[PDB]
Amino acid sequence: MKYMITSKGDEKSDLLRLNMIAGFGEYDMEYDDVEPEIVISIGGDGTFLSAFHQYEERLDEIAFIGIHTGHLGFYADWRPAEADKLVKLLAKGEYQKVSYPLLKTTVKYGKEATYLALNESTVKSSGGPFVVDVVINDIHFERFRGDGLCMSTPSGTTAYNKSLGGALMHPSIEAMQLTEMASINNRVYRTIGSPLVFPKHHVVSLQPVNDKDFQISVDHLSILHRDVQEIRYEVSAKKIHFARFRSFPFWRRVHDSFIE
Amino acid sequence: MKYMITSKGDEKSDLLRLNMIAGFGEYDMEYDDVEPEIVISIGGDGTFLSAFHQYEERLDEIAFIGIHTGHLGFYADWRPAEADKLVKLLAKGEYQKVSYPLLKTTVKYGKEATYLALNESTVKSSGGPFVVDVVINDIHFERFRGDGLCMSTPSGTTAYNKSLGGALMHPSIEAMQLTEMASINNRVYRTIGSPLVFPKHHVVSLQPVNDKDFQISVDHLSILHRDVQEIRYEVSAKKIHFARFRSFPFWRRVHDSFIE
Amino acid sequence: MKYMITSKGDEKSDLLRLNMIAGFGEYDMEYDDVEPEIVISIGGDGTFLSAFHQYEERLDEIAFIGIHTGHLGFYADWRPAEADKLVKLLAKGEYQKVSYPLLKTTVKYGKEATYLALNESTVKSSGGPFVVDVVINDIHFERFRGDGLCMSTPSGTTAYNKSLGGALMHPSIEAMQLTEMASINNRVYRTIGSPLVFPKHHVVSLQPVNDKDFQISVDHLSILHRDVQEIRYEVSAKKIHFARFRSFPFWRRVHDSFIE
Amino acid sequence: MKYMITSKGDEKSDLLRLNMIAGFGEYDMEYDDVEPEIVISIGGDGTFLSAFHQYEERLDEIAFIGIHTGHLGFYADWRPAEADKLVKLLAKGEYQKVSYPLLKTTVKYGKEATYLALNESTVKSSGGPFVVDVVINDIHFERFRGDGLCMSTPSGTTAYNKSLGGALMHPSIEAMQLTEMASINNRVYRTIGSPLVFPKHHVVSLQPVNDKDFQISVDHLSILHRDVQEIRYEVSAKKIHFARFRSFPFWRRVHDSFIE
Numbered sequence A, B, C, D: 001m002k003y004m005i006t007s008k009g010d011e012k013s014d015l016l017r018l019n020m021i022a023g024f025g026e027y028d029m030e031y032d033d034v035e036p037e038i039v040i041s042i043g044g045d046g047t048f049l050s051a052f053h054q055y056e057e058r059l060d061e062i063a064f065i066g067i068h069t070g071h072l073g074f075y076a077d078w079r080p081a082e083a084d085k086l087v088k089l090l091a092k093g094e095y096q097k098v099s100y101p102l103l104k105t106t107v108k109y110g111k112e113a114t115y116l117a118l119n120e121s122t123v124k125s126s127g128g129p130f131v132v133d134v135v136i137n138d139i140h141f142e143r144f145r146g147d148g149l150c151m152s153t154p155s156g157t158t159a160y161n162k163s164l165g166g167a168l169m170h171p172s173i174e175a176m177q178l179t180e181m182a183s184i185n186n187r188v189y190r191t192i193g194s195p196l197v198f199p200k201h202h203v204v205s206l207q208p209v210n211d212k213d214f215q216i217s218v219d220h221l222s223i224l225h226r227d228v229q230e231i232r233y234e235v236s237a238k239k240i241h242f243a244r245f246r247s248f249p250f251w252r253r254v255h256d257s258f259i260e
């Protein structure tokens, strides 16, 4: 079937990509990077992130697979020396799809822009004090002062969210998690402190207080947005699909990356 | 219909209970504390906890309601001066049921005991060092050293779980959250650090390393369990049901208790 | 004696400044903003910070006093309605000097620049990943990956340092405290996690790993430093001197700002 | 000179102790465990703690040395295979004394008891809610609700204090650090949150609110104190003295125990 392979760009990953293409040449497999049905990423989680955003407009037709060339990633869970068995396994098919939730970010001006995040989306100010009003389902919840806020997907909770004190949530939970960055709390300023975990259909909305310029990130992309009236976070209707050939539980994946 | 009222025991709550009984005497309402269908609790969240555990063996036939006499509770969300409108509203019926998830705790010896928690269940040692192996779905995840562990329900995340750094999760999420207590981490000992959020059907299992005596709590109850071979945590099939007469969102309930 | 008054710039602070000058006109007091011996600041801690950095090259000849017009500050500890008693008290003299420690920051290129901080000095990258080697007294301590680092004075521990998890240390301790910003920790990357408190004469040195451009802050000032070979932190030989007329303990000052 | 050796009790430490005694038999060294001038501890930091408390009433006449048999300790900083060079080095003398500060704990009833801590002293309730008023230099600072409080020496900050979020402070700083255990914070209850670092001569005083029974620990000892009116913490006039033969900086000692 149609497939394509993206590479981190170094000597190891490039020459690994060519050997898998040569293997696929021995099967009923067509290379096409315009309309692939299997997207193989060789490199790190950054390379996987690129592959995801490269094809984010055909998510329900693509199954992703990641190979990690030098670390072990959360999205790239195949060893380079296991690439041969991967070629064969894919060649037959009848494999299994597992799906992870994604985060939708909407930015409104005084035309509205929408983004999709697999890890997280963060907001900071463009230099100067970051102050925003936090609104949950049209109800005012708190006035946040600090360095910024981070809204994470389930599979992203092991990334930036973890460094901010957030909890690691299993990706079978359709949720999003908001964490604080160096929140100031005193007698006059008051934030919840704790990470918040929202279900599907809950809309968290950030609204400027004075400054209307914010540095907004979605995964690895970061843009300075001018004249912002609203940022809206919610769990996306879209999901990312993975091809799985073997049992590799999320908590096992958490164990191997952080314990030993 | 059948109903009963529990009271915190002070002058304010007792005399409030009698006036509601007198009001119910003017309607098609029968008082029965053996088989109630509505359980009204007057006092604090501790009084609500007692009412829950008092009737925990008929959960799918009971709708709980809480009145708070001096603070505002997470489970008790009616003011004392609003008791009259509560009597009328209940008297008709046709109200709405909303359900929150609960946590099942199983303790195995070398007969097994099961408990139900609405807030959380915690484990500490009976004096001396607390060391347990943490096993997630039959796979060894980590060896925990510290003061103890805390497994929280969704609605309990605003209680002990919050003081331990856990996240507040919306109660429409069928999940449980495990948090650490003063975990020791160095070059030789290694814990995940972060709170973990588990879905339904995931079994977290604590297993002793040396000492087999632990002080186990379920909500307000705390018992020293001798000769423990296993403690098992999982999201209960049982749920607690609340009668609701008005919109009072969880995040609004979080706002009022912690922000202003 | 020689004195000057700086103002936040709003209607309240300006007209308060003029009335104190008019009061000082009734005493043996000369206004001079080139060589003052008493520096009065009217506004907030930001206004006090400006007054400090404005005269940071004559610290051992100046005693600072702060008046707060709308909050209560840590450095500005006099109420606007107490300004009259302040004028009289200053006019006699024979008051007391109390001194707080300061932080020296040195930045070396491949000419070296030195700065003085009353609150703290922070380091972040100029976009992209922040990676530095942390060296304590010429010995390599750790490789830090995250958002940045913050080195705080004693009196600054209640500012940014507090929001990063640092401890509040009494200003009679000649020390500096380093705190982490969203440090990444996994199986391969390893930071101490905890805040570190250094005595006089200990030199903490940050050294770039790849990128040599950092956004460095000293109190309110923030500059992008190009081609950085070393940043050096140590407790300054210089100290800031305050005129005190009444007992107002630091822990009382902490209490009023954060408890009630 | 007079010396004695304490041992962890296992086969490795006992037979190591006998060989050093046999070595000392070849020098001008007298074994005496009633009035030693050098106290050698073989085992772990727990064994060192015992040796310290065993001789805590002759601190200014004793220099401690620690050997670690199976880990590496903060107080025991000599390898078992380096014991021979230790015997020789001690035998001459003219070595160097370095001193670390200690914490004094006073417990008053309605006769007062005083204790000395090298690591820390903690307070919890004897089951039930822990509520105490925190008073700093006779001024009321906060009402603490939670699991307990921990007051740490400088060298103890790498022990329990570290697991509670405290900062690691260099032992040349005559200070003590207080950290919180699972403090409850909401709209009505309010704690500082942050660790507090106190200088010499500052007295922190805990006072019961309702319950007067507390479980008080000093290092490894833990006693249930009945009818408590006051607990007083302050930096002790006494100090512990170490014999040093080589440079082994505290931050190097921190590095080796937590980084690699």
Ligand SMILES: Nc1ncnc2[nH]c(C#CCCNC[C@H]3O[C@@H](n4cnc5c(N)ncnc54)[C@H](O)[C@@H]3O)nc12
Residues within 6 Å of the ligand: A045, A046, A047, A049, A074, A075, A119, A120, A155, A156, A157, A158, A159, A160, A161, A163, A218, A219, A220, C145, C146, C147, C181, C182, C183, C184
């Ligand atoms: N999902 C994952 N789970 C576990 N590990 C993972 N690594 C990755 C990846 C990758 C390469 C491209 N990274 C861009 C991402 O850098 C994370 N990030 C940024 N600043 C920090 C920080 N100060 N502390 C921890 N993180 C940070 C966040 O993810 C941001 O989007 N993804 C995951």
Ligand SMILES: Nc1ncnc2[nH]c(C#CCCNC[C@H]3O[C@@H](n4cnc5c(N)ncnc54)[C@H](O)[C@@H]3O)nc12
Residues within 6 Å of the ligand: B045, B046, B047, B049, B074, B075, B119, B120, B155, B156, B157, B158, B159, B160, B161, B163, B218, B219, B220, D145, D146, D147, D181, D182, D183, D184
């Ligand atoms: N669900 C809730 N959400 C928000 N507030 C709430 N208050 C309650 C309640 C009640 C009265 C009976 N309490 C027993 C419960 O004491 C909590 N707890 C114990 N030790 C601590 C601590 N050191 N720090 C915070 N908490 C603690 C935990 O809940 C334990 O089970 N329930 C909730």
Ligand SMILES: Nc1ncnc2[nH]c(C#CCCNC[C@H]3O[C@@H](n4cnc5c(N)ncnc54)[C@H](O)[C@@H]3O)nc12
Residues within 6 Å of the ligand: A145, A146, A147, A181, A182, A183, A184, C045, C046, C047, C049, C074, C075, C119, C120, C155, C156, C157, C158, C159, C160, C161, C163, C218, C219, C220
């Ligand atoms: N010494 C003090 N103690 C207690 N409160 C204080 N307020 C001040 C002040 C002031 C007005 C000018 N501020 C510049 C200062 O903003 C602090 N800062 C920056 N970002 C954050 C954040 N995300 N979270 C908390 N802080 C932050 C830090 O101080 C930086 O230098 N000084 C103190």
Ligand SMILES: Nc1ncnc2[nH]c(C#CCCNC[C@H]3O[C@@H](n4cnc5c(N)ncnc54)[C@H](O)[C@@H]3O)nc12
Residues within 6 Å of the ligand: B145, B146, B147, B181, B182, B183, B184, D045, D046, D047, D049, D074, D075, D119, D120, D155, D156, D157, D158, D159, D160, D161, D163, D218, D219, D220
């Ligand atoms: N000074 C030190 N620095 C770095 N490591 C060290 N290890 C030792 C030692 C030892 C063996 C006897 N221990 C009794 C001590 O157990 C610590 N402790 C108790 N509960 C915990 C916990 N939940 N988390 C971390 N700690 C804890 C505390 O020290 C208490 O007093 N001393 C130090």
